Design a protein around this ligand. Structure first.
Ligand SMILES: [Mg+2]
Ligand SMILES: [Mg+2]
Ligand SMILES: [Mg+2]
Ligand SMILES: [Mg+2]
Ligand SMILES: [Mg+2]
Ligand SMILES: [Mg+2]
Ligand SMILES: [Mg+2]
Ligand SMILES: [Mg+2]
Ligand SMILES: [Mg+2]
Ligand SMILES: [Mg+2]
Ligand SMILES: [Mg+2]
Ligand SMILES: [Mg+2]
Ligand SMILES: [Mg+2]
Ligand SMILES: [Zn+2]
Lengths: 99, 206, 60, 25, 82, 128, 91, 118, 155
RNA sequence: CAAGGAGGUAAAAAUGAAAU
RNA sequence: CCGGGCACUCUAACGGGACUGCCCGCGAAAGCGGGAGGAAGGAGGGGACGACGUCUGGUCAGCAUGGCCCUUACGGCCUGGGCGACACACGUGCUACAAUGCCCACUACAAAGCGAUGCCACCCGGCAACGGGGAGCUAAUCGCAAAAAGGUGGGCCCAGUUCGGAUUGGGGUCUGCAACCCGACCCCAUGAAGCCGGAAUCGCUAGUAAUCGCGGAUCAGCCAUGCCGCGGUGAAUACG
């Protein structure tokens, strides 16, 4: 019933921090749908390489925003207990909602 | 010439970020401006420390700020000032958790920003630049470096004629990705103008 | 006209259409990205610095 | 007639819709 | 092309209407084409600014959607060598 | 009713090919292998690996397709049909190689590169 | 008589006395030269040693060039007692 | 058939033949024959005289067309004669009315190139 | 400087025929990369061949190409600011290419209305030895004929 | 199978640029 | 669409995968040619990467900065004008000159990206632009979008003609304090030049040229036919 979403710019921190919550939910009495890899939202932009006025030949950058989903079954305060405030991100945004 | 910033050229693999936080739109713009104003405010009254980095991390009103310094001499024991209101003056336009840490950069002769900054000081001391370059390189090479390279360009020793002094010992492969190459830069302000100091420090990888 | 001109860019009163974007790091009025609030010049500088969270070189 | 404002083809090219090119169904 | 607005300058009209009761003098300036021809005070002259000076334009019916400054060219041209 | 693998891809096109051992040479997806591919000459070339083998309608085709346009889909179907008959007939390998019906064909649309007008077409100049 | 300008800064210095288009230390210099080119009734008058006068070659044929200072030139076309296309440029 | 001021178009579809009149174009064309109730794909070759009469009576009336509306259009430009606006001066000088680019192009009103050279 | 001799491109055989030639012809018909319209026109014209003559288009088309084959062509070469025109032999690859190219071009040169009838007729004319392409072929061989003088320059 | 000594030699295509 | 399942497809995270390693031939070696080996090969196809240096190259109008000059002003604010001017010349382009074409209707097949101070389903008024409503969507959920060339049917029948769309008149919409100078669309009527380009000149060697539409940045709006991307169909030729 409990749905958690984890967005992030770094994939290595995401693929690891959203895997901790798979271990911290499985070893507390619940069935956990593993790291669901939602598609990425790549936000590119292309900037002229020079401060002057050399239109041809520039250089572009991208801001990949990754999405990862995990669902746990029963909202028992046994699994809730651990995932309550035992948070270890580096800024990774987490969404917790039940529906 | 034309060569890409050896830091940006890595970023992903080798050399991580310097401001590590995540946000969507309507927030990124505000938090980046604040973030940059922290870097701007710190650089001023903390230059005497000579800061190699200014790492920043966030987590909803958490704002962690790690200041790497060769010699953290300007911290002086708890209530001995140089930290108290100093790490608290940040929250005069922030008001968030101003968690300011201090790191001890062990060898300053292996920190590119510090190397270039030491050189740029010497330019303003009216030192002989070519000899200053040579020494700084060997100094870096003396402290165990796998390769080094310092570059001062323009208006050397005053004198109407922009020059470019060049020195580099050992190995500095800029094209390679598994490089671990530290890059630093510094503005030397002189009574006759402005000149830039590049500093490249290289260690192994694989 | 540059100092009094980066004043108006933040002042923003009097008719809603007279307000415009403006790089914060610089004072550039052109090629100002809404996402960063920066000109294309400054944005490139900081992206190479590493001071742009997540922002990375694009190769494909 | 990619530039004639009285065709489904010119309306495509211009982008906009209208009588010569209705917004589907 | 407005339809439910169809506007004239309030300040142009203030000066134009309070100088319209039982008659007036043609001494009346402006600084904005922005307005519109305005019926009533047709037998009037409106010195419109063209960027350099105030050109006395005259109203004699015939004009409507043409605000003002169309009766006040801003350029000169006049000729190209010939 | 039945199943036989199916993974044919060509230039952003995905086709899952099944075939069910029955004399009814049939179709899939929208309408007929015709109908859905009518007016298209090269559409019927996807059934050439069946001609390469001894299949004059021994299977009931079932290919769900997606992505790309018709031609790529048709190409992908060819790769899927072949991928089926090579799967449940491992000895039918000695015809998918000489005839070359088994290749994903990495030939895909090349990226728009800056400066150039489109892929490789240079923007054209005059010195004067 | 000077009759046409190509350089805006030059134009403003001679017409309105606007000096903000030229170098500040070359104001007097450029002025005395322009007045000389204005008073000149023939190219032979623009021949003082301090001007280093000469006609240009190639595509710039028909033009002349007196020296202001350093690598800086005032170029023009002199014809029938008048100079045209007064430009300020590098050598 | 001498419909308005013209008669020319013979064997060539009435919805098309109609077009050959200053005032008809394409929209008023099918609009006129659906309102008159006549088959558009007909021969134009003098078919049923009745259909031709009804068509003529409706078309030639209703809206202004041919030489009459050419006169009105020319008179609408003559409006900006007197002491007219800016748009009139553009009709005076022979230059484009809608304020476009005249540095190049604008040949459809200026006419073929004249070349000054200097 | 052509270090590689540029290997000969190979095609896909068509539908119903299996030609290693017809598809090459359909390609020349093809404009803007529409093989659908291209192939259709040829097969259309194939249906048109059946009408005016009781012959199978696979031979009518085949023989037409064979009749629009340049035995030898003229080649401009060396010494004198490239002044000479040595008449050279034509490679089977080039006869191939010229035949199909001249066919389609001459076909669209015809005053007919539909693309199919142009193709069909130009093929029938060429199969006989009458086509405008056959003119082109015979013309190119005239040029090669008149240059036998310094043909011994060869190469 | 390896070369020295001998001979016919390109064409029609001119200028130079604006302080060291 | 539900029950249920997640093997297929896809999604995105780490991996496996060829190194001419294996066979023939050539060679002193490097290596080259050829062959089953497989999705792939003798740098697989594209990116990011630009040596010492050169051009007194470019940029004091991104920014920084030595020097020179201006300070009731070379600074500051405002309304209006101008950057959009047009007898002309060059560059890069878009749309065409038609029948492998144009118009109308029906009916399919993408990728890559953007949106809750917005994208706006479905209705309602309206020929239409668009307006009234109003659901879902912090968005592999909802929306932008039906991709277009294609296919089927039908109509023009080769004439500047249902090719072509310039130019101009009239009527309207939407953003905006306001669109005359100088906004984009919509509708009616006009319908120009052009019937394929002189001397010259450009691009591209395989998904490539050509052709077709789609997205984004900036952005109240938009002068975008531009730029940066995405995929659809898909040639010709290389002797030398
Ligand atoms: Mg360009
Ligand atoms: Mg802006
Ligand atoms: Mg493409
Ligand atoms: Mg204009
Ligand atoms: Mg000479
Ligand atoms: Mg010389
Ligand atoms: Mg490399
Ligand atoms: Mg220079
Ligand atoms: Mg400056
Ligand atoms: Mg401009
Ligand atoms: Mg004509
Ligand atoms: Mg014609
Ligand atoms: Mg190549
Ligand atoms: Zn800036």
């Amino acid at each position: 019933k409990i749905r958690i979403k984890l967005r992030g710019f770094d994939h290595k921190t995401l693929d690891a921090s959203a895997q901790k919550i798979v271990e911290a939910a499985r070893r507390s009495g619940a069935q956990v749908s593993g790291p669901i890899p939602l598609p990425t939202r790549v936000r590119r932009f292309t900037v002229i390489r020079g401060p002057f006025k050399h239109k041809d030949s520039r250089e572009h950058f991208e801001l990949r925003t990754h999405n990862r989903l995990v669902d746990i079954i029963n909202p028992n305060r046994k699994t809730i207990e651990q995932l309550m405030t035992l948070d270890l991100p580096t800024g990774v945004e987490i969404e917790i909602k039940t529906v | 010439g034309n060569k890409i910033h050896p830091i940006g050229f890595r970023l992903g693999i080798t050399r991580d970020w310097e401001s590590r936080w995540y946000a969507g739109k309507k927030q990124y713009r505000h938090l980046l401006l604040e973030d940059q104003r922290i870097r701007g405010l710190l650089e001023k009254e903390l230059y005497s420390a000579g800061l190699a980095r200014v790492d920043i991390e966030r987590a909803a009103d958490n704002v962690a700020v790690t200041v790497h310094v060769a010699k953290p001499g300007v911290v002086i024991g708890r209530g001995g000032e140089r930290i108290r209101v100093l790490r608290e003056e940040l929250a005069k336009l922030t008001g968030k958790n101003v968690a300011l840490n201090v790191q001890e950069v062990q060898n300053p002769n292996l920190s590119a920003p510090l190397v270039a900054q030491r050189v740029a000081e010497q330019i303003e001391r009216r030192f002989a630049v070519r000899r200053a370059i040579k020494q700084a390189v060997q100094r870096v090479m003396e402290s165990g470096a796998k390769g080094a390279k310092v570059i001062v360009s323009g208006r050397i020793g005053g004198a109407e004629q922009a020059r470019t002094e060049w020195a580099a010992q050992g190995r500095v492969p800029l094209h390679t990705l598994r490089a671990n190459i530290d890059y630093g830069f510094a503005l030397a302000r002189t009574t006759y103008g402005v000149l830039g100091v590049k500093a490249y420090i290289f260690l192994g990888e694989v | 006209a540059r100092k009094a001109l980066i004043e108006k860019a933040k002042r923003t009163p009097k008719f809603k259409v007279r307000a415009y974007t403006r790089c914060v790091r610089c004072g550039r009025a052109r090629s100002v990205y809404r996402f960063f609030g920066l000109c294309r010049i400054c944005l490139r500088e900081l992206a190479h610095k590493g001071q742009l969270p997540g922002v990375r070189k694009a190769s494909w | 007639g990619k530039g004639d404002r009285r065709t489904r083809r010119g309306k495509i090219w211009r982008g906009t819709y209208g009588k010569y090119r209705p917004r589907k169904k | 092309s407005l339809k439910k607005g169809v506007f004239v300058d309030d300040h142009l009209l203030e000066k134009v209407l309070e100088l319209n009761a039982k008659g007036e003098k043609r001494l009346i300036k402006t600084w904005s084409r922005r307005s519109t021809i305005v019926p009533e005070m047709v037998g009037h002259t409106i010195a419109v600014y063209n960027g350099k000076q105030h050109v006395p334009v005259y109203i004699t019916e015939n004009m409507v959607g043409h605000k003002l400054g169309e009766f006040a060219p801003t350029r000169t041209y006049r000729g190209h060598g010939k | 009713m039945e199943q036989y693998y199916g993974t044919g891809r060509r230039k952003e096109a995905v086709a899952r090919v099944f075939l069910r051992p029955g004399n009814g040479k049939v179709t899939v997806n929208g309408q007929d292998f015709n109908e859905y591919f009518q007016g298209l000459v090269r559409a019927v070339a996807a059934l050439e690996p069946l001609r390469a083998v001894d299949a004059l309608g021994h299977f009931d085709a079932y290919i769900t397709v997606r992505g790309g346009g018709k031609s790529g889909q048709i190409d992908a179907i060819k790769l899927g049909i072949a991928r089926a008959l090579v799967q449940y007939n491992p000895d039918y390998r000695a015809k998918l190689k000489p005839l070359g019906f088994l290749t994903r064909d990495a030939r895909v649309v090349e990226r728009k590169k800056y400066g150039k007008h489109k892929a490789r077409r240079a923007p054209q100049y005059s010195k004067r | 008589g000077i009759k046409s300008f190509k350089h805006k800064g030059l134009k403003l210095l001679f017409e309105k006395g606007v000096t903000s288009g030229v170098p500040a230390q070359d104001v007097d210099r450029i002025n005395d030269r322009l007045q000389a080119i204005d008073t000149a009734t023939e190219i032979g008058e623009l021949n003082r040693q301090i001007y280093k006068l000469h006609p240009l070659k190639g595509d710039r044929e028909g033009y002349w060039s007196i020296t202001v200072r350093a690598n800086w030139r005032i170029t023009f076309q002199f014809i029938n007692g008048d100079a045209y296309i007064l430009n300020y440029e590098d050598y | 058939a001498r419909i308005a001021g013209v008669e020319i178009p013979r064997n060539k579809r009435v919805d098309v033949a109609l077009t050959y009149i200053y005032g008809i174009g394409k929209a008023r064309a099918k609009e006129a024959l659906e309102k008159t109730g006549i088959n558009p794909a007909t021969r134009v070759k003098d078919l049923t005289e009745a259909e031709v009469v009804r068509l003529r009576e409706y078309v030639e009336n209703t809206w202004k067309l041919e030489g009459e509306l050419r006169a009105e259009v020319a008179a609408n430009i003559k409006r900006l004669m007197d002491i007219g606006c800016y748009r009139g001066l553009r009709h005076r000088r022979g230059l484009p009315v809608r304020g476009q680019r005249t540095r190049t192009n604008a040949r459809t009103r200026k006419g073929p190139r004249k070349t000054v050279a200097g | 400087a052509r270090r590689r001799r540029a290997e000969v491109r190979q095609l896909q055989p068509d539908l119903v025929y299996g030609d290693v030639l017809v598809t090459a012809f359909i390609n020349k018909i093809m404009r803007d990369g529409k093989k659908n319209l291209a192939a259709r026109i040829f097969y259309d014209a194939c249906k048109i061949i059946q009408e005016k003559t009781g012959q199978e288009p696979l031979k009518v088309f085949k023989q037409a190409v064979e009749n629009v084959k340049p035995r030898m062509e003229v080649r401009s070469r060396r010494v004198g600011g490239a002044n000479y025109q040595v008449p050279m032999e034509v490679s089977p690859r080039r006869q191939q290419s010229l035949a199909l190219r001249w066919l389609v071009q001459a076909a669209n040169q015809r005053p007919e209305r539909r693309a199919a009838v142009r193709i069909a007729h130009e093929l029938m004319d060429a199969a006989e030895g009458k086509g405008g392409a056959v003119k082109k072929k015979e013309d190119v061989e005239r040029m090669a004929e008149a240059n036998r003088a310094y043909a011994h320059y060869r190469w």
